[PDB]
């Protein structure tokens, strides 16, 4: 029972080829644009009217002709046509004097638009040159449904067509697009038309072009475009692109050049998403592509590397094979998320990029997918808002986690084969759910890799058509040598019976034979529950999900939880580190949902004293963060600090001062960042003094710049009780950087001062007009409240003053005000803070309506209440160590 709509185009007519010409004088900051399009189309059901899409465009003329011999051959003028647009369905209808009969026709429309300023259609972007002058560029973003903002078209992904694009623009600017340049022609006194080669069959949402004065770096058939003053930061992207494209060529067994003679990447200063996979011309926001080793962090580099991998994966999964309709958008975004980490790991083996997948995708997916509002992977949509809303954690991380599950179940070679079958089959066409299963099946037909009578499709449908994921319960009738397992839907929040039955692949491992590295032994639960007969002593632990490859949580009897717990106390590395990470996150969420005694889960985490690897500590960091945030303003908070001190103080035998030795790995860097972060949060004076000194050493001249891989921590803590000269130094550094990611990190870092007078002055700089972008001014507010309770207070004190909320609201919106109020609410934990909040609401007067005020109080009250709820009592209790 999913009702949708009549927002779908009439099915009477169908595109064949678009011949698009656009003119823009964006070099002059002229923001109108003009266009003509010649659309070759097929009529299937005889009609008087051709219906396609338009948002915002104003037609000036239109006419039709027939093509009596196909697409080559001459047209014969039928007549001028009538145009009208429905603003709600965004259907434009061209109406002929005659009724057209099933054949090939040529529609020709002249039209005029304007460049968006919300980063969505054909829009404007800009940057500031080294001499202070602002320079404009026109660029595109169509995915979802915005190709209709640049030219009238059949804007649905299943209606693939060829595209021949030409653009008129300033002689002094360059145009690029999906396809290579076919030819320049200078015109008038000032201008030029750039012509592009015809595309293959593709969807409108992937069409793209850019008109700018940018520069390129290159290597063979691949370039990277950047604003001229970012040229030195484009080297990494070009390396990564070459390596990643090749890995994918080989692995999938279809080279990219099978269909395209070049692949460009471009960094666009104003960009809504992280990046967009337009065939042959992939757009990025700057933070997703630029890297500068003097100031960019290992995290930043990882973001560039994964994003490139993500969008290159789309050249096959999305571009070559596109979704028939958005219901199957996971066919794109699931594979892109998986290969975001997998292709990258194949492209830089030994940098342990693939480890990042378990915490950044699997566990991340389970968090959102444990909510009652989560959707099934297959889920339809009709309106533009409904379509955007599909681009969520289910389309991305969930899909990517289940695909990773399938990949392991099928085996590497079968997997590759399956995909090559799929891609080959649906090449230059649309795909749905079942066509993928067909492909994967073919590569294992007769090979007896699945139990007899079971399809690839039988399995995937249980995961694809059902919201959420299961928890697999494992109960042992111990001293008696059996195990019972059973499955129910997992919620973060509640236990609610569910009729659907996931076909779940499982395996398991016991204490004497502790091998987690093979995947030959996959078993299936295809019913609600089952008895597993077995060999294992009541003294040995068992653990079910090998390296958390299966997309499900696992719960055990308190017995087996305690066996496990003991085993990791005596020898902390006795279980695979990903499985330790599974146990940590599983225990955490099982306790929160009330499927497991909190006391048990907390007992299980004491083992971390001895822990030394990246995955488990990353998992732990999420549980600890939650507890930290709920205890913070409360009396019991001291005992939490003590408890966590106990957990880390050992592993705090790393180097955080100068951490960076050339030999320490990616994973090490993450680990160092997580542990030092905690130590500094807790006020380890060693941590606070070293960071403080480093910053002082760089701001003073005494010493070198702080290495980027340690800057996040060092600049934030280190600023805690720093003096005016170090605050100003860091502030001037940010204002002089032309690097967005740097700027953001420094804005956050300034936010960590404990000095309320610094914070308020800092906030004042974000108001009025220094060179913040809008997003950065908002960022300053966020830095201040995210710094700690002292910034929150600084912010509240600021907003109490009515003249100050006046300035605040005139330069940021009221939405930024309501946003900050929510943030403050999320961080009030005690009576004294609740007073401060209520005082602010009241002081703000007519800016806060009753509804919102009620909401703020509600989220704040939930925090105060939390301290004496069952959780919270259970926890304050447990923190009665002695």
């Amino acid at each position: 029972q999913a009702v949708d709509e009549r927002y779908r185009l009439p099915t009477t007519s169908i595109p064949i080829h678009y011949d698009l010409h656009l003119r823009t004088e964006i070099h002059r900051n002229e923001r109108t644009f003009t266009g003509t399009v010649g659309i070759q189309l097929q009529v299937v059901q005889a009609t008087d009217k051709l219906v396609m899409h338009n948002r915002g465009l104003v037609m000036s003329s239109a006419k039709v002709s027939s093509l009596p011999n196909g697409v080559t051959g001459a047209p014969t003028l039928i007549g001028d046509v009538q145009y009208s647009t429905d603003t709600t369905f965004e259907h434009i209808t061209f109406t002929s004097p005659t009724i057209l009969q099933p054949g090939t026709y040529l529609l020709e429309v002249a039209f005029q638009g304007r460049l968006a300023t919300n980063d969505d259609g054909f829009y404007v972007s800009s940057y500031v040159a080294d001499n202070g002058e602002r320079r404009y560029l026109a660029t595109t973003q169509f995915e979802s449904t915005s190709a209709r903002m640049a030219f009238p078209c059949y804007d649905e992904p299943g209606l693939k067509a060829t595209f021949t694009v030409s653009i008129t623009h300033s002689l002094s600017y360059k145009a690029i697009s999906n396809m290579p340049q076919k030819t320049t022609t200078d015109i008038e006194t000032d201008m030029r038309t750039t012509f592009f080669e015809k595309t293959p069959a593709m969807s409108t949402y992937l069409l793209a072009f850019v008109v700018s004065d940018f520069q390129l770096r290159l290597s063979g058939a691949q370039r990277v475009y950047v604003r001229p003053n970012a040229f030195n930061e484009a080297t990494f992207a070009l390396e990564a692109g070459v390596k990643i494209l090749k890995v994918l060529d080989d692995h999938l067994g279809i080279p990219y050049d099978t269909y395209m003679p070049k692949l460009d990447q471009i960094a666009i200063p104003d960009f809504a998403a992280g990046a967009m996979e337009n065939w042959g011309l992939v757009t990025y926001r700057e933070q997703a592509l630029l890297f500068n080793p003097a100031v960019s962090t290992y995290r930043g580099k990882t973001n560039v590397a994964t994003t490139i991998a993500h969008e290159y994966a789309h050249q096959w999964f999305g571009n070559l094979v596109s979704p028939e309709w958005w219901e199957y958008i996971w066919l794109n975004e699931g594979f892109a998320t998986l290969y975001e980490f997998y292709a990258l790991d194949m492209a830089y083996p030994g940098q342990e990029y693939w480890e990042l997948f378990n915490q950044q995708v699997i566990q991340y997916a389970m968090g959102q997918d444990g909510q009652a509002s989560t959707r099934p992977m297959n889920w339809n949509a009709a309106t533009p808002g409904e379509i955007s809303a599909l681009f969520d954690r289910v389309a991305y991380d969930k899909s990517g986690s289940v695909l990773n599950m399938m990949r392991h179940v099928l085996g590497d070679d079968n997997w590759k084969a399956g995909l090559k079958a799929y891609l080959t089959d649906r090449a230059l066409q649309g795909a749905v759910d079942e066509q993928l299963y067909a492909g994967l099946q073919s590569a294992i037909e007769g090979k007896g890799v699945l139990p007899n009578g079971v399809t690839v499709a039988q399995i995937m449908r249980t995961w694809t058509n059902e919201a959420g994921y299961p928890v697999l319960n494992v109960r042992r009738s111990y001293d008696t040598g059996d195990v019972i397992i059973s499955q129910e839907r997992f919620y973060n929040d509640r236990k609610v019976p569910n009729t659907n039955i996931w076909m779940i692949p499982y395996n398991y491992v016991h204490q004497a034979k502790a091998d987690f590295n093979e995947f030959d032994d996959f078993q299936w639960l295809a019913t609600k529950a089952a008895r597993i007969e077995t060999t294992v002593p009541a003294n040995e632990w068992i653990v079910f999900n090998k390296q958390q490859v299966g997309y499900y949580r696992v719960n055990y009897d308190e017995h087996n939880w305690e066996l496990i717990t003991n085993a990791l106390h005596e020898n902390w590395a006795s279980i695979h580190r990903l499985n330790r990470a599974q146990l940590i996150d599983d225990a955490y969420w099982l306790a929160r949902s009330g499927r497991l005694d909190l006391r048990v889960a907390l007992r299980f985490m004491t083992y971390l004293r001895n822990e030394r690897e990246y995955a488990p500590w990353t998992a732990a960091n999420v549980a600890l963060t939650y507890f930290n945030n709920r205890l913070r303003g409360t009396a019991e908070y001291h005992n939490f600090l003590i408890f966590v001190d106990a957990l880390i103080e050992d592993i705090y035998s790393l180097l955080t001062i100068d951490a960076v030795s050339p030999d320490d790995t990616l994973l090490h860097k993450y680990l160092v960042q997580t542990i030092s972060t905690w130590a500094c949060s807790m006020g380890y004076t060693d941590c606070l003094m070293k960071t403080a000194a480093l910053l002082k050493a760089e701001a003073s001249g005494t010493g070198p710049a702080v290495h980027p891989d340690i800057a996040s921590v060092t600049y934030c803590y280190g600023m805690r009780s720093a003096l005016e000269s170090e605050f100003q130094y860091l502030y001037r550094k940010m204002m002089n950087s032309k690097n967005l990611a740097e700027r953001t990190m420094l804005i956050d870092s300034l936010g960590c001062s404990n000095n309320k007078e610094f914070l308020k002055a800092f906030l004042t700089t974000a108001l009025g007009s220094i060179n913040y972008r809008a997003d950065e001014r908002r960022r300053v507010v966020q830095a201040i409240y995210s710094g700690g309770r002292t910034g929150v207070d600084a912010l509240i004190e600021f907003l109490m003053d009515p003249a100050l909320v006046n300035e605040f609201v005139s330069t940021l919106s009221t939405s930024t005000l309501n946003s900050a109020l929510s943030a403050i609410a999320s961080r009030t934990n005690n009576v004294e803070e609740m007073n401060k909040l209520n005082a602010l609401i009241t002081a703000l007067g007519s800016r806060v309506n009753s509804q919102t005020a009620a909401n703020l109080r509600t989220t704040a009250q939930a925090n105060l209440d939390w301290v004496n709820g069952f959780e919270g009592l259970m926890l304050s209790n447990f923190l009665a160590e002695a």
């Binding site: 996979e277 926001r285 892109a336 975001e340």
Partner: peptide, 5 residues
């Protein structure tokens, strides 16, 4: 696309 972190 790739989303914003």
């Amino acid at each position: 696309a790739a989303a914003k972190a």
